[PDB]
Amino acid sequence: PVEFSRIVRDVERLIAVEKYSLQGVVDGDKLLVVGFSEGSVNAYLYDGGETVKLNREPINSVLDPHYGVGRVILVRDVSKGAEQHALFKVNTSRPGEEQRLEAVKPMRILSGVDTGEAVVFTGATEDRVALYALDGGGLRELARLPGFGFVSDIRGDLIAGLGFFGGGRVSLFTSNLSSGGLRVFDSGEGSFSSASISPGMKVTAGLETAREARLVTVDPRDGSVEDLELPSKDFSSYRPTAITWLGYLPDGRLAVVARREGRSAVFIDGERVEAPQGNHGRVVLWRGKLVTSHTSLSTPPRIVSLPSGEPLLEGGLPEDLRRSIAGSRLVWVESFDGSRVPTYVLESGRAPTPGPTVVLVHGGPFAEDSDSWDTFAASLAAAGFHVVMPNYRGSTGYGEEWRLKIIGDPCGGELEDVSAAARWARESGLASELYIMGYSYGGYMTLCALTMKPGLFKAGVAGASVVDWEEMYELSAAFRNFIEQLTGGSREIMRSRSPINHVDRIKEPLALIHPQNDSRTPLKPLLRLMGELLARGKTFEAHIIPDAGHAINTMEDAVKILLPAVFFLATQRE
Amino acid sequence: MPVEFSRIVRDVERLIAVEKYSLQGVVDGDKLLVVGFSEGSVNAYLYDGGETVKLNREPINSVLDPHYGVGRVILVRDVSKGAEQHALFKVNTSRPGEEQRLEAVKPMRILSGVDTGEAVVFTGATEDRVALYALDGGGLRELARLPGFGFVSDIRGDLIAGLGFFGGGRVSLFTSNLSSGGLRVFDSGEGSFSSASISPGMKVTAGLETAREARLVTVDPRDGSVEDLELPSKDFSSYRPTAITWLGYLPDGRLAVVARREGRSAVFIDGERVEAPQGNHGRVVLWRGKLVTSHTSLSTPPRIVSLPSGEPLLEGGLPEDLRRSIAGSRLVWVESFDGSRVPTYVLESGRAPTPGPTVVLVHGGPFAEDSDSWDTFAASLAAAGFHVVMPNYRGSTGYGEEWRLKIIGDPCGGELEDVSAAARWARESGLASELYIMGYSYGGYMTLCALTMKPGLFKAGVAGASVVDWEEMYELSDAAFRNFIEQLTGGSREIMRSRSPINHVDRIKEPLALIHPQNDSRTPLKPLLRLMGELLARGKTFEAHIIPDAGHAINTMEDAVKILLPAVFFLATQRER
Numbered sequence A: 001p002v003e004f005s006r007i008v009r010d011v012e013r014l015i016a017v018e019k020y021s022l023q024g025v026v027d028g029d030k031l032l033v034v035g036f037s038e039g040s041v042n043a044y045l046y047d048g049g050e051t052v053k054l055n056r057e058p059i060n061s062v063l064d065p066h067y068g069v070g071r072v073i074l075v076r077d078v079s080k081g082a083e084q085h086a087l088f089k090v091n092t093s094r095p096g097e098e099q100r101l102e103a104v105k106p107m108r109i110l111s112g113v114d115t116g117e118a119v120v121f122t123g124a125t126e127d128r129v130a131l132y133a134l135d136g137g138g139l140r141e142l143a144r145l146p147g148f149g150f151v152s153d154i155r156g157d158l159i160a161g162l163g164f165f166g167g168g169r170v171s172l173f174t175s176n177l178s179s180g181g182l183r184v185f186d187s188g189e190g191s192f193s194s195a196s197i198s199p200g201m202k203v204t205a206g207l208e209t210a211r212e213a214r215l216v217t218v219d220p221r222d223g224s225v226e227d228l229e230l231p232s233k234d235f236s237s238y239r240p241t242a243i244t245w246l247g248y249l250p251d252g253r254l255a256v257v258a259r260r261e262g263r264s265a266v267f268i269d270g271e272r273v274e275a276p277q278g279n280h281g282r283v284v285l286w287r288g289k290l291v292t293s294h295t296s297l298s299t300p301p302r303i304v305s306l307p308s309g310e311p312l313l314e315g316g317l318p319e320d321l322r323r324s325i326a327g328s329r330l331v332w333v334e335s336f337d338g339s340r341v342p343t344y345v346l347e348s349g350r351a352p353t354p355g356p357t358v359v360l361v362h363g364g365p366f367a368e369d370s371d372s373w374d375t376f377a378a379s380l381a382a383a384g385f386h387v388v389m390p391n392y393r394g395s396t397g398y399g400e401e402w403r404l405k406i407i408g409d410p411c412g413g414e415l416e417d418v419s420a421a422a423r424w425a426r427e428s429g430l431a432s433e434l435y436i437m438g439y440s441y442g443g444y445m446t447l448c449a450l451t452m453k454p455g456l457f458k459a460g461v462a463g464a465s466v467v468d469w470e471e472m473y474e475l476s477a478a479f480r481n482f483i484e485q486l487t488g489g490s491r492e493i494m495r496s497r498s499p500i501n502h503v504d505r506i507k508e509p510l511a512l513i514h515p516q517n518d519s520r521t522p523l524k525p526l527l528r529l530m531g532e533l534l535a536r537g538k539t540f541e542a543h544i545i546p547d548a549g550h551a552i553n554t555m556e557d558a559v560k561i562l563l564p565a566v567f568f569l570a571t572q573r574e
Numbered sequence B: 001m002p003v004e005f006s007r008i009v010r011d012v013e014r015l016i017a018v019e020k021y022s023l024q025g026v027v028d029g030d031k032l033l034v035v036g037f038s039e040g041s042v043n044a045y046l047y048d049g050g051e052t053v054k055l056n057r058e059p060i061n062s063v064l065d066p067h068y069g070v071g072r073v074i075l076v077r078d079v080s081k082g083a084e085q086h087a088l089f090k091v092n093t094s095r096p097g098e099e100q101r102l103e104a105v106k107p108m109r110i111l112s113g114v115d116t117g118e119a120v121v122f123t124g125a126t127e128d129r130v131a132l133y134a135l136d137g138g139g140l141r142e143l144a145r146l147p148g149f150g151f152v153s154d155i156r157g158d159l160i161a162g163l164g165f166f167g168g169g170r171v172s173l174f175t176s177n178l179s180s181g182g183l184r185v186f187d188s189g190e191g192s193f194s195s196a197s198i199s200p201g202m203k204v205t206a207g208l209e210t211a212r213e214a215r216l217v218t219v220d221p222r223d224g225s226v227e228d229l230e231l232p233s234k235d236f237s238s239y240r241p242t243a244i245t246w247l248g249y250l251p252d253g254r255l256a257v258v259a260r261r262e263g264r265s266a267v268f269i270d271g272e273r274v275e276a277p278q279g280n281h282g283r284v285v286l287w288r289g290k291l292v293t294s295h296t297s298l299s300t301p302p303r304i305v306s307l308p309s310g311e312p313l314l315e316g317g318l319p320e321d322l323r324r325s326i327a328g329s330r331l332v333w334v335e336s337f338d339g340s341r342v343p344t345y346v347l348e349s350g351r352a353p354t355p356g357p358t359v360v361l362v363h364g365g366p367f368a369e370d371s372d373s374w375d376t377f378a379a380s381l382a383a384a385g386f387h388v389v390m391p392n393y394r395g396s397t398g399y400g401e402e403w404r405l406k407i408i409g410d411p412c413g414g415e416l417e418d419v420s421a422a423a424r425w426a427r428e429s430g431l432a433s434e435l436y437i438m439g440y441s442y443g444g445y446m447t448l449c450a451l452t453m454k455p456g457l458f459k460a461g462v463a464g465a466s467v468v469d470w471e472e473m474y475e476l477s478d479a480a481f482r483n484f485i486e487q488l489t490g491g492s493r494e495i496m497r498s499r500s501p502i503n504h505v506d507r508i509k510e511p512l513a514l515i516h517p518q519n520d521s522r523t524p525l526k527p528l529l530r531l532m533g534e535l536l537a538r539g540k541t542f543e544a545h546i547i548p549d550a551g552h553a554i555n556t557m558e559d560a561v562k563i564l565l566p567a568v569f570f571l572a573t574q575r576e577r
């Protein structure tokens, strides 16, 4: 019989576990870390096995400090739930004492850096998006931005950042601290992902293309772009597809974190440094040693030392639960047309082999299953399910060709990909029985699978799903454009690939989890689906929830959204 | 401030899992036949000498009443995933766990039955009729068609007696013959029959509930003559019961009666009162010369006890912590809109201050009652930090025929005023700091009835397995349930319409939580989907949980958790508001 209170207890601990991000080095030589829990967030100084809390009430984030600055700028929402933020300064020698920066009116704070002398940030109001500089003599608007924009780095008087200024791409920009203004460097056929200013006052940037990422140097004096050449060739030989973060360390070396196939690697002046398998955040130099953040499908975000990978700060889980979440691995699953589908697998320590296995389908579809911490997948492992996470075609992270294969073919090839992953789990000896679970586009897939491939999965869970493309099309500007694109402008594809037109074929129990009042995934089509299921005597469960937030932060959110799915699946295990 | 979810699940889990027992009879070689909720589902057991043996394999719904000593048991099991199309399965008491399906009986809604050992006699409902059946060597025979829901009470020789809801919410007595069939119906101008058993003299002894009192009568089935029955001890008559729960003749010819007043029952043999544990008792049987009954109370889950010692033969256990979350129970008489006094049980949470969060928990039926009897819902609420108020609105049993029959033709009328008065009482008495409403089946109907007709009374509502639309429900129901809907609404389509909460959604101003088993055929789902469309159309907030492969009669651990947990969670969240 299902141990319900165990599942809720575990889901509780996985939601509560503290999660850490590295922000920089301050106060001479202390780590600045932001720690997150149950969606609640604080700022800490770390040094030598101990933390000190800097803020009082929960915050939203902090600005990027320059190495060594004696203060930290907290960003905090001014109402509870509102886009308007205010800025609060804390001296690192007087933690817990906050001085509100009254010169900055509430607004949506998008990013920022604190040089120690000037606070430079981007913000959005009713009027505009702007770059601002706050110094001792008050607030100045350096520039108005033609879109959402983010400060990456300041060195001397030169400011660099990334802007979403049109054409579907991230462009690079620069400004001056003293004179302001804006210069935009267009990314051409790629997008800039990160930027840092060299001692030579060049902007080094990560340029992501259709295929392989490029490290480039951009001379801000003339807009010239050249591939950057590093003293060690490890980085180039790695052939990354994306660049997560880069920055110059105080001693002038360039730190870069790049990734491919859902895992990242750390490089210093092109030379690779050993790091724990997974994904890494920013790298800082601290008392002569290198420090980064780490996360994986089995490891909540934490701070590690390199190259040992020893944790400095990590949240606590009980011995019991840590052992439920075993290692993650990547496997390349072969699909119907021979194309290989990169699929992350998370093994449960609480399930034998072969054992119950969930194929957990990501939303988007323009998104990626990477080797990074996921409350959903971890909850499944804790409840005694292996989790299989396939990057079906349409996914990001593997080049433009793979992403664009979904166009005109929803519920076609990408379903074969998902189906091949399931097959792979059964025949590899991992799975004794197979389930499917997914949210948004993932829920659409779930319904797509149970209709077009009955007898493949034992049960399905569909969250925030879409049911009928044609009805959705006529009810939706932005989403109508998207639906047109995805279906190749074909009403025949809208109709044939809508699961509500094939309910008749479902042979397996289905669990629907849906928001009561969200215009993005509306409820009306789901009631029709439920009427159809009922009329045809199909087994189904439904949980309809008002006022769900689109991300699992708190225990409340988890209970509404995640818990019923895990319960349902545990009962299907009969 | 934040809802302690893991504590609630744990407590709810234990309160559902605790074993519960019901006494069904005596079989085989002087063995108790017991139905237990145990190991997570409803099962049938033989008890003898401090051990049980499980008779069935997969969970069952119930079993037929065995005659003393028969060598077999008839299991009743839903073969339609909750929709209550039942099939019958025979098990030889010497070969427990081996089931032979009785293929001559097509699936239908089994309402009751008795197994003489030679013939299985039962009542059932299909789409087109309610009937009395006999299954014997000659196959399946339809002894009679019944003009409504009907229940077999007893068989002695060829004579069959039972109770039938054959109109006006009155319960009549009927008889039939095993060999020849047919139907004879005996009405009372004074009241309703509640129970029946055939004497050795081939008279039917019956409990007759009148306006505000009950008593025992003898009915000669050869001429319909009714006489007050004279017992050798006067304890029973001095008790002045208001209702008669059960009666039966034991093998040695003594007459066993269980009668109640004010939500507690007493046991009588040939009129003489027998010491029994305070609460409510079920059937009495004679076993190894001693008397055995079932017992339950607001603090004691259903268990089997020996009388008069009251020593348990079978019971489940609760941890002390759970036991203490129920601080105390009491009966209070709440005054309603018309001066009628509404007997209302109150369960005070040990985990809530006074005044504190209080749920008005409305019982189903409506022909049923909140008594000093175990209630998983109520105990769960007390555990989660809610006082529970349980009003016996008009329509309830346990307080005379007049009180029961006031509901006829007036659903969502007076009985709502009764429920509303109880809520009022809890606030003004100092018990309640805030008020919630929660109910299942007719109780869920009342929840919807309250939130539509009395907005602003409750802070939030939970409606489980609810009635939504009497008309649509009428079209969807089987013979028996269609007849019953007719009776409750006084045959008025105007009442069906005006008293259906779906026609008043516009008036709802409070958060509503809907909980429904998908395959329920007493309270179907289809009208609920429409309600959800109505709520959505009218801009109301609500949450809904639809449970798969379950109908009205929840018989597993898993179904129970999925139906009860969301209710308690919802209410605890409404509290942190």
Ligand SMILES: [Cl-]
Residues within 6 Å of the ligand: A276, A277, A278, A296, A298, A299
């Ligand atoms: Cl790891």
Ligand SMILES: [Cl-]
Residues within 6 Å of the ligand: A003, A006, A007, A382, A383, A384, A570
């Ligand atoms: Cl589990």
Ligand SMILES: [Cl-]
Residues within 6 Å of the ligand: B090, B102, B120, B135, B136
């Ligand atoms: Cl038979």
Ligand SMILES: [Cl-]
Residues within 6 Å of the ligand: B340, B341, B342, B399, B403
């Ligand atoms: Cl009364």
